[PDB]
Amino acid sequence: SNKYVTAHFMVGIVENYTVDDWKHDMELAKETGIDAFALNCASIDSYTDKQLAYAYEAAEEVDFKVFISFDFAYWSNGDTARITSIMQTYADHPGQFQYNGAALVSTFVGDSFDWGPVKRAVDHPIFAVPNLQDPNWAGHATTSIDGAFSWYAWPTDGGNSIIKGPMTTIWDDRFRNNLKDKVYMAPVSPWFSTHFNTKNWVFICEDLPHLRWQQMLEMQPELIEIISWNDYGESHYIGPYSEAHSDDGSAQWTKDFPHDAWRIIAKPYIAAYKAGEREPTVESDQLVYWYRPTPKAVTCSKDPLGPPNGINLLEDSVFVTTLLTEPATLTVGSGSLEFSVDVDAGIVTNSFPMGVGSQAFSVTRDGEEILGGDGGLDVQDRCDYYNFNVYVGSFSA
Amino acid sequence: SNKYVTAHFMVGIVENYTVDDWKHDMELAKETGIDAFALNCASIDSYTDKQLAYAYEAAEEVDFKVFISFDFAYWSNGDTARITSIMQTYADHPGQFQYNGAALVSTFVGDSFDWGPVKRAVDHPIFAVPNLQDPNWAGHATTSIDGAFSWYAWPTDGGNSIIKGPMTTIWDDRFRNNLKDKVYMAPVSPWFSTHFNTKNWVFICEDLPHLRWQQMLEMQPELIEIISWNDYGESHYIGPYSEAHSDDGSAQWTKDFPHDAWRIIAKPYIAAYKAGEREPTVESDQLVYWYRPTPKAVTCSKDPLGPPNGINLLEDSVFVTTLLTEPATLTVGSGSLEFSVDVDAGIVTNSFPMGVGSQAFSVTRDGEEILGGDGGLDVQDRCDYYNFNVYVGSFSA
Amino acid sequence: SNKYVTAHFMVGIVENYTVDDWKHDMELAKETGIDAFALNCASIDSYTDKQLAYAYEAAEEVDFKVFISFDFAYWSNGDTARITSIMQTYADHPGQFQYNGAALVSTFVGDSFDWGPVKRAVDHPIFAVPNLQDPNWAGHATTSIDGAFSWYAWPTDGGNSIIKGPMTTIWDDRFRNNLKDKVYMAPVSPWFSTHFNTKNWVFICEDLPHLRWQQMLEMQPELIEIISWNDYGESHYIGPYSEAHSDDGSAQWTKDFPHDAWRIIAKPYIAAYKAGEREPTVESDQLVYWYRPTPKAVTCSKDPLGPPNGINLLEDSVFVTTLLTEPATLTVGSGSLEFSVDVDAGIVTNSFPMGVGSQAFSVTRDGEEILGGDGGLDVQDRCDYYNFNVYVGSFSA
Amino acid sequence: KDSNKYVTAHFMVGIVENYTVDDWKHDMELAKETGIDAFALNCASIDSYTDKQLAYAYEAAEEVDFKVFISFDFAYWSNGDTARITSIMQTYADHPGQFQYNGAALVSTFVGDSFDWGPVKRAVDHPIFAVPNLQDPNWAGHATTSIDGAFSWYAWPTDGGNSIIKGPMTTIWDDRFRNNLKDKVYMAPVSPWFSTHFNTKNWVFICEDLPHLRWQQMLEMQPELIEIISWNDYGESHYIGPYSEAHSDDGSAQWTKDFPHDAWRIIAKPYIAAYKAGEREPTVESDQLVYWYRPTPKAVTCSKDPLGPPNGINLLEDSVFVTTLLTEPATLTVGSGSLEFSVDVDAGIVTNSFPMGVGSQAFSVTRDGEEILGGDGGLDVQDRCDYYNFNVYVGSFSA
Amino acid sequence: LYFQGHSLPGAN
Ligand SMILES: OC[C@H]1O[C@H](O[C@@H]2[C@@H](O)[C@@H](O[C@@H]3[C@@H](O)[C@@H](O[C@@H]4[C@@H](O)[C@@H](O)O[C@H](CO)[C@H]4O)O[C@H](CO)[C@H]3O)O[C@H](CO)[C@H]2O)[C@H](O)[C@@H](O)[C@@H]1O
Ligand SMILES: OC[C@H]1O[C@H](O[C@@H]2[C@@H](O)[C@@H](O[C@@H]3[C@@H](O)[C@@H](O[C@@H]4[C@@H](O)[C@@H](O)O[C@H](CO)[C@H]4O)O[C@H](CO)[C@H]3O)O[C@H](CO)[C@H]2O)[C@H](O)[C@@H](O)[C@@H]1O
Ligand SMILES: OC[C@H]1O[C@H](O[C@@H]2[C@@H](O)[C@@H](O[C@@H]3[C@@H](O)[C@@H](O[C@@H]4[C@@H](O)[C@H](O)O[C@H](CO)[C@H]4O)O[C@H](CO)[C@H]3O)O[C@H](CO)[C@H]2O)[C@H](O)[C@@H](O)[C@@H]1O
Ligand SMILES: OC[C@H]1O[C@H](O[C@@H]2[C@@H](O)[C@@H](O[C@@H]3[C@@H](O)[C@@H](O)O[C@H](CO)[C@H]3O)O[C@H](CO)[C@H]2O)[C@H](O)[C@@H](O)[C@@H]1O
Ligand SMILES: OC[C@H]1O[C@H](O[C@@H]2[C@@H](O)[C@@H](O[C@@H]3[C@@H](O)[C@@H](O)O[C@H](CO)[C@H]3O)O[C@H](CO)[C@H]2O)[C@H](O)[C@@H](O)[C@@H]1O
Ligand SMILES: OC[C@H]1O[C@H](O[C@@H]2[C@@H](O)[C@@H](O[C@@H]3[C@@H](O)[C@@H](O)O[C@H](CO)[C@H]3O)O[C@H](CO)[C@H]2O)[C@H](O)[C@@H](O)[C@@H]1O
Ligand SMILES: OC[C@H]1O[C@H](O[C@@H]2[C@@H](O)[C@@H](O[C@@H]3[C@@H](O)[C@@H](O)O[C@H](CO)[C@H]3O)O[C@H](CO)[C@H]2O)[C@H](O)[C@@H](O)[C@@H]1O
Ligand SMILES: OC[C@H]1O[C@H](O[C@@H]2[C@@H](O)[C@@H](O)O[C@H](CO)[C@H]2O)[C@H](O)[C@@H](O)[C@@H]1O
Ligand code: NA
Ligand code: NA
């Protein structure tokens, strides 16, 4: 079979993409180690058939792969006929991601969608790994599935309480015990913060951009899907902020908040995971940092939406992942405060109390400053709008 | 044999029950005409054998009956020795419900569990009526069953698909077709709404709390199991909200949502069903009402589970079942909406468009009001969490 | 706010702690609302540097904080240079508790230790709040202190006579009246009982597990230090009994005596204290109980140590703190004796006469029992060793 | 990991339904006398008296200052019994009678290699030291079941698959287990004998000098723990405890009621001491002799026995075995029927074996012409039998 | 002397 890493791509926000915009995304996906984009599309978008076409063409031109994620918040069980005709077009397309000789197909929800009639009407074999909510259902589904994709990327206990971290693998283990002789696609997400009038909460992630990958080496799922490449609206994008996507409102908390440096962390772990290593290998000294724009208690001045649910469980911290070939001393300035920790060789995340004002990072070995600089955003104690996304940046020696 | 009515009881949530807690539920089931509780227990609960012991003791003390429902979401075929030793304890307990001289036993799922080894190891005869997902396997079952219990209590196309109502008997007929001479335990459920990470949907029930009982008089299955007595998490409880049960998170949408009044509908139909009568007998003038707490299109922005699947197929209605000895006039006030219908004698369900605000109900005969009052709960257009449970109430002359 | 609660942690008994042991302790403190551990360490322990390093790392990993408590029962004024190099290691570690931007440092005694030389050699600012015996020295110390920590956690009148309680705030006033521009760290301690051949006495505490938090909301000090997290030797631990710690001989009176339930009282008072409320808020219905294992006059059978000084001033009582949302009746069975008392909503402590034998508690409201059970420990009228520690337990709804 | 070594003994809870606490006390006092630290309480989920007897056994332990731990017999317990396993551990992990290995509650199994201890440990407050019985050495080395060690059941000569090979016993399997138990704990098995005669199991392993040989191996190997198989498994003939009044006959009374094995504890005791003290030789206290032998030649034909002869018996020897425990060298003389043997024996603990003769058995130890101990075998060797019995009779004499 | 930073339940 081999191991593969996919990334969740929001087709709904790229109405105006060209083939070239797609190729730029997949090129940056390729150089992270990602094998394929899950193209998350909706029945209600007039641009779905066009943009699926562009994505598969782009995949073919840059030798990336793609598979379709039928987003069943929009698709319905009564859409079988359409879904079949789409699979007929793309299951045997050269750009279609193939898992064990079959066209991978997944979904967002759609636990009840029967893939049997789709599979029977398409010549080319299909490998159906829908997103399922219940591990028990994943182990006994009657819908002709070949594995399950868990959306449990963040700490949760089973209810609609926001719970503290850190992330545990409890839900992965429940899924895995039910999927014995089937495939498990584990989710990997750095972050979660959403601020729409139809959804306004955070999950408690913190060191999640690093720790989740550590869990992937322990657990070795058959597949990984990164949530997400470009879902700006829920703040878990690790892809670039593309000029051509259509803003859904999330520009407010994503436009000046690059997340690209998180691909610096994912890259060594994607390689280790595909190689079956238990520990990543650091090739050069780098540093990744992330922090929210304000302390969590800063009441904003203008926001037509309330503060997000769950923010009292966040910590006011600056997070720093160092990827070093030899041990060193990490020094962090956060506003008026300064901290220092010795940090070992390898990939290591530390958290520092967040202070209002300038952020500065330095890594020294013997007496040599090996890398360092100012964080790209000042922490503030005022805000117009509740922004619980994070700014991410990096230094590379 | 005779006909009996049973009710699904969650042992999993009564860890702290005393024998008296059981006896209270048992008395309320006895007043409804219920013959036995299905004790739905799991192997993974330390307290299963304790609460099974109290249950059987309580049954004998109040001349009530119980039988075990092994929940095979938790039990497995590896548990045969334990299941056999439990059957050896209780198959001839004085509280054990006996169906034509055999101890009734059932399950949740566990279609492939073989009762042969269990029956050949227990002296007392056992009557195995497991929950089977496949009507056809109910006819060719190699597992030494004496009947099948259907869990198709709600409108569905299979795979837990949600479809518009009303409830039909399509699945019941497949079971009775394939069972031939074996026993059929038909499910009766008033509602379905659940709001957890692993399950977040509604079935489209609506007038189901009445319409299913009418379907039972027409159908006359050998047995009936009410889903359920106390499954708060799925909103189909007809028993009281008990103070001793353990909250699984469902108190959020059930603490203030009594469903006791639905027993007013159940009681005369249970009697007609055991009598084999084709129509219920109304002894006194009564009215049962139910409705959801909000219009279906309300947005609950902080609820991290998001809205349940299926809600677009619901209607915003107030539902009213009248139990009338004589024709009369029903008037309902729903917010600013105003309705009046001539209701015939007997048991009749009417539904009316939902209006936000206070609800009011009145039955008049010869221009004299014979029962009425204000709905226990005001319908509202704002909400913290999605709740698609119903408030149920009644009025009696 | 700018108000924090700390707990006194015995570094001397955790030579074999791992970082993970420390994390478990800190997580349980974090759950209680405690902000930092006072790392009470000795110059003579070979493992002080290691275990200091562990604790600070663990604070970093679970985003807790720690500060060093130099135990001047062991440290001497001649240790200035070693204390300085330790403060240079940790004053700017992220795990280090910062108070108004300065590294908090404290001590056990050491009244005469001069902090000026330490402040002068350490670049990071330092906030020194040593334990001072004399309130007047707190008012006029020449040792460059920024506040004072009182050890007056129990009833005492200035001399070495043991006195009856209850606790008063007499010593708290004396300190505050000497610290009206510096910081007062007030002690909070639930109990006191020690039984070594170098210290063998009780203080008279009784209702102190609750009374002292009440005094804190009135006496609103700048900081609180809880005595203690894990000093089993003096029976004032509120932390778990950790198997990783090294028994000094106190296991004889602490192995079978959990104190964890006192954290149920602390948590609402810690919340109120930080939020400046003068009354705590009760979340759900709970009960905490505690009692000594024998009537105080029981002469025991093989104790190589005499009866502790002061035990004749104790009361043979069972103490119950009810945390309640509405009023209720509390009934207490102690041996062959049964008592009841009506109990208001809120947090209320009642004492009950001790009877030898088993102990039972139940809280009733509207006839229903809402919480109750048996105490984990039967009161005995014989014993091998003098044990004036208490057994603590709880019940929750 | 514990600075000290310990010896435990496998105890069948399944045969002691009618035990009282006092019956337990009696067994534990004789185990204490031997230097054994704890009983492994081998119990089954399907016994209605498991909780009654575990309770009695923990109380007895605390009352006589002995220790116990639970051996979950996974021929009956199943991986789906985590909840009950977990709750029994919460009852007993901190019981006064619970054996603690370096502060954690010891827990063991028979088989159950895939049972996951993680969920138990995580749900039990008091720490737990998981040393299950594992059949594969290689799997002891990278098990995913949260184990702190492995307990080997390779107590007898075998090529695996319960194959029967000639002895003498070697440590080939202990090495495999120790090689894969790098940092973790190895609990090695010590068994004197093996003969079982049931429908489901009817064979012998070739043990012979095993009741002594295996202890000598333990002083060279110094495993972190030892479990003696067994205290009272009468059914497999490896019991070293008394034949108790109160146990329930499972059918083994036929070959065990008149076959005391207590004298084997005389060999056990000094070797338990050298093992715990990390010493390479035992210390002999007084001159003693321990003898054992089967009741009949191995070619005896028992036509009435529907089980037929046990598998393996062709590799046995018709021998009488004698272990001498001498403070100074002496001469061993043995009479077996009309056979007559004498051999010089060094000081220390030495086993000799002599061809078996039908009839009266006799033993004598003399030093420079002077009798120091000896007497008649407790059982005449017979050449005709009703049922195949390949258990041994065991006796002793003391100077 | 070097630590693993933020880490999963297990190191130590
Ligand atoms: O009104 C703006 C926008 O509307 C149309 O475009 C929609 C497009 O914005 C986008 O909306 C998605 C949502 O569907 C939703 O996606 C969730 C996602 O957040 C997460 O839960 O994962 C699941 C599966 O991936 C998704 O269902 O929320 C995100 C923000 O967090 C929204 O951006 O996609 C939908 C459907 O594809 C589009 O209809 C309209 O075409 C466009 O012109 C306009 O800009
Ligand atoms: O032999 C036992 C133990 O000795 C060494 O470890 C010592 C360790 O037990 C512990 O001893 C403390 C005492 O120092 C003393 O602490 C008091 C405390 O009770 C209270 O008065 O407050 C002040 C400040 O907190 C402390 O001074 O008494 C407690 C019991 O109440 C003892 O546990 O810490 C000391 C010093 O750090 C250790 O030296 C030895 O290293 C260790 O291996 C051995 O187990
Ligand atoms: O999570 C907190 C809770 O966990 C443990 O108790 C469990 C208890 O909550 C309950 O769990 C139930 C689920 O098994 C499941 O029940 C299904 C029914 O919804 C439905 O009718 O269909 C089938 C068959 O009837 C059931 O499997 O979901 C419900 C909620 O809808 C949920 O209540 O029972 C289990 C197993 O018996 C308990 O283990 C824990 O023991 C408890 O202390 C804690 O409060
Ligand atoms: O398994 C749950 C489904 O049960 C019913 O669907 C049945 C089909 O799965 C199919 O099952 C056959 C089965 O009964 C058995 O006898 O062996 C056959 C060969 O392996 C199976 O193909 O056909 C049955 C007859 O049409 C169906 O009854 C429910 O209809 C479905 O909703 C459930 O998901
Ligand atoms: O029907 C509501 C219950 O759904 C979940 O339990 C499922 C079982 O009911 C059963 O689901 C059947 C399914 O296999 C399919 O083929 O069609 C039937 C009709 O829709 C379904 O009833 O089997 C599933 C797999 O084991 C179960 O997940 C919930 O767990 C349960 O609580 C609900 O009451
Ligand atoms: O070896 C004496 C025991 O045999 C039977 O129990 C077996 C287990 O001990 C174990 O057998 C191992 C087997 O898997 C093979 O791989 O070789 C090993 C060395 O010979 C064996 O020890 O597992 C078997 C399968 O579950 C068991 O049947 C008897 O039941 C037991 O009483 C004997 O003590
Ligand atoms: O055969 C009648 C007895 O059966 C039940 O007791 C069992 C015990 O005999 C005991 O069985 C051992 C068995 O598990 C295996 O290890 O072989 C041994 C012989 O070498 C057997 O002694 O343990 C079982 C499980 O713990 C018991 O279930 C009845 O309970 C008992 O009353 C009868 O005497
Ligand atoms: O409440 C209805 C749906 O709202 C949420 O999803 C929204 C999506 O449908 C679309 O309108 O975009 C917004 C954000 O731009 C999304 O929040 C729910 O999470 C979804 O499941 C509901 O069907
Ligand atoms: Na059929
Ligand atoms: Na055994």
Q: DSSP string of D309-362?
A: SPBTGGGS--EEEEEEEESS-EEEEEEETTEEEEEEE-SEEEEEEEE--SB-EE
CA-wise closest residue to B79 among D50, D49, D77, A181: D77
**CA distance linking residue D155 with residue D139, whole number of Å:** 18
Interchain proximity A350–E5, CB inside 8 Å = yes
Q: Does C218 touch chain D (CB under 8 A)?
A: no
Q: Does C21 touch chain E (CB under 8 A)?
A: yes
C315 near C207, Cβ under 8 Å? no
Interchain proximity C57–E9, CB inside 8 Å = no
Phi-psi region of D191 (alpha: psi -120 to 50; beta: other; left: phi over 0): beta
CA-wise closest residue to A344 among A326, A364, A369, A361: A326
Which residues on adjacent β-strands are paired with residue A338? A333
Interchain proximity B198–A310, CB inside 8 Å = no
Phi then psi for residue C309, to 5 deg, are -60, 135
Of A112, A133, A143, the CB nearest to B198: A133
- Ligand 8 atom 16: residue of nearest CA: A198
CATH architecture of A4-275: Alpha-Beta Barrel (3.20)
Q: Does C246 touch chain D (CB under 8 A)?
A: no
**CA distance linking residue D136 with residue B231, whole number of Å:** 45
CA-wise closest residue to A312 among A392, A202, A211, A235: A202
DSSP secondary structure letter of residue A340: E
C292 near C387, Cβ under 8 Å? yes
Which residues on adjacent β-strands are paired with residue C69? C40, C106
Interchain proximity C53–E1, CB inside 8 Å = yes
Cα dihedral sign, B270-B272-B278-B283: negative
**CA distance linking residue B283 with residue B276, whole number of Å:** 18
Q: Hey, of C17, C18, C19, which one would you mutate to test binding to chain E, going by the most E CBs within 10 A of its CB?
A: C19
Helices (H), A91-169: 116-121, 135-140
Q: Which residues of E touch C21 (CB under 8 A)?
A: 12
Residues of chain C with CATH 2.60.40: 286-396
Chains adjacent to E (≥3 CB pairs closer than 8 angstroms): A, C
**CA distance linking residue C70 with residue C113, whole number of Å:** 10
Helices (H), D127-237: 137-140, 172-180, 210-221
Measure Cα distances from C26 to A92, A166, A343, D122 in Å.
55, 14, 22, 18
Q: Hey, of A173, A208, A211, which one would you mutate to test binding to chain E, going by the most E CBs within 10 A of its CB?
A: A211
A87 near A122, Cβ under 8 Å? yes
Phi then psi for residue C389, to 5 deg, are -60, 170
- Using CA coordinates, name the residue in chain D closest to C246: D103
Amino acid (1-letter code) at residue A184: Y
C90, C92, C95, C100: CA torsion to nearest 10: 120
C302 near C320, Cβ under 8 Å? no
Half-sphere exposure of A288 (CA within 13 A, CB side): 23
C216 near C269, Cβ under 8 Å? yes
Interchain proximity B45–D79, CB inside 8 Å = no
Query: Please, which residues have CB within 8 angstroms of residue C395's CB and are 6 or more apart in sequence?
Result: C286, C287, C361, C363, C371, C372, C373
D222 near D278, Cβ under 8 Å? yes
The reply to whether omega before A76 is within 30° of 0 (cis) is no
Half-sphere exposure of B172 (CA within 13 A, CB side): 20
Distance linking the first and last C-alpha atoms of chain B = 37
CA distance C242 to chain D (A): 9
Residues of chain D with CATH 2.60.40: 288-398
D291 near D320, Cβ under 8 Å? yes
- Using CA coordinates, name the residue in chain B closest to A141: B159
Say how many residues make up chain D: 399
- Ligand 4 atom 3: residue of nearest CA: B134
- Ligand 3 atom 25: residue of nearest CA: B108
Say how many residues make up chain E: 12
Q: Give residues 90 to 149 of C whose Cβ lies within 8 Å of A.
A: 92-94, 98, 101, 124
Interchain proximity D45–B79, CB inside 8 Å = no
Q: For the domain bounded by A286-396, which CATH number is listed?
A: 2.60.40
Query: Please, which residues have CB within 8 angstroms of residue B217's CB and are 6 or more apart in sequence?
Result: B269, B272, B273, B277, B278, B279, B280
- D113 Cβ below 6 A of ligand 6: no
Q: Which residues of B touch A310 (CB under 8 A)?
A: 304
- Using CA coordinates, name the residue in chain C closest to A165: C62
Chains adjacent to A (≥3 CB pairs closer than 8 angstroms): B, C, E
Phi then psi for residue A97, to 5 deg, are -60, 130
Cα-trace Rg, chain E: 7
Residue where the block lists tokens 């139809």? A198
Q: How many other CB atoms are there within 10 angstroms of residue B60's CB atom? A: 14
Q: Decide the pairing of beta strands B317-324 and D6-12.
A: unpaired
- B306 Cβ below 6 A of ligand 8: yes
Interchain proximity A350–E8, CB inside 8 Å = no
Q: Does A343 touch chain E (CB under 8 A)?
A: yes
- Quick one: A286 exposed, middle or buried, by C-beta within 10 A (0-12, 13-18, 19+)? buried
3-state secondary structure of D229: coil
Atom of ligand 3 nearest to the CA of B246: 45
Query: Please, which residues have CB within 8 angstroms of residue D55's CB and are 6 or more apart in sequence?
Result: none
String of b and e for D153-173 (b: at least 16 CB within 10 Å)?
bbbbbbeeeeebeebebebeb
Rounded to the nearest 5 percent, the helix, strand and coil shares of chain B are: 25, 30, 45
**CA distance linking residue C348 with residue C22, whole number of Å:** 33
Q: Decide the pairing of beta strands A4-10 and A223-226.
A: parallel
Interchain proximity B81–D76, CB inside 8 Å = yes
B351 near B388, Cβ under 8 Å? no
Residues of chain D with CATH 3.20.20.80: 6-276
DSSP secondary structure letter of residue C363: E
Phi then psi for residue D250, to 5 deg, are -95, 10
* Helical axes C19-32 vs C262-274, angle rounded to 10°: 60
**CA distance linking residue B123 with residue B140, whole number of Å:** 26
Which residue from A198, A234, A250, A305 has its CB within 8 A of the most atoms of ligand 8, so it is best to mutate? A198
Q: Do chains D and B meet with 3 or more Cβ pairs nearer than 8 Å?
A: yes
3-state secondary structure of C36: strand
D395 near D291, Cβ under 8 Å? yes
C185 near C149, Cβ under 8 Å? yes
Say how many residues make up chain B: 397
B351 near B208, Cβ under 8 Å? no
D261 near D222, Cβ under 8 Å? no
For domain D6-276, the CATH class is: alpha beta
String of b and e for D104-135 (b: at least 16 CB within 10 Å)?
bbbbbbbbbbebbbebbbebbebbbbbbbbbe
Q: Which residues of D touch C256 (CB under 8 A)?
A: 94
- Nearby residues for ligand 10 (ion, Cβ within 5 Å): D 110
Amino acid (1-letter code) at residue D20: T
Q: Give residues 169 to 208 of B whose Cβ lies within 8 Å of A.
A: 195-200
The reply to whether omega before C240 is within 30° of 0 (cis) is no
Measure Cα distances from C103 to A338, C98, C179, D211 in Å.
11, 5, 20, 67
Fold for C4-274, please state it.
Answer: TIM Barrel (3.20.20)
- Ligand 4 atom 25: residue of nearest CA: B136
- Quick one: D299 exposed, middle or buried, by C-beta within 10 A (0-12, 13-18, 19+)? exposed
Which residues on adjacent β-strands are paired with residue B66? B37, B96
**CA distance linking residue B73 with residue B78, whole number of Å:** 13
Interchain proximity B159–A143, CB inside 8 Å = yes
- Using CA coordinates, name the residue in chain E closest to A327: E2
Of A168, A211, A344, the CB nearest to E2: A344
**CA distance linking residue D121 with residue D138, whole number of Å:** 23
| Specified resolution (Å) | 1.9
CA-wise closest residue to B346 among B265, B397, B262, B281: B281
D215, D218, D220, D224: CA torsion to nearest 10: -160
D332 near D324, Cβ under 8 Å? yes
- A140 Cβ below 6 A of ligand 4: no
**Cα A165 to the center of its chain, rounded Å:** 17
CA-wise closest residue to B79 among D45, D318, A27: D45
Longest dimension (CA), chain A: 67
Residue where the block lists tokens 């208001």? C344
Q: How many other CB atoms are there within 10 angstroms of residue B383's CB atom? A: 16
Token readout for C93 is 């570690």
> Could you say which of 2.60.40, 3.30.70, 3.40.50, 1.10.10 is the CATH number of the domain covering D288-398?
2.60.40
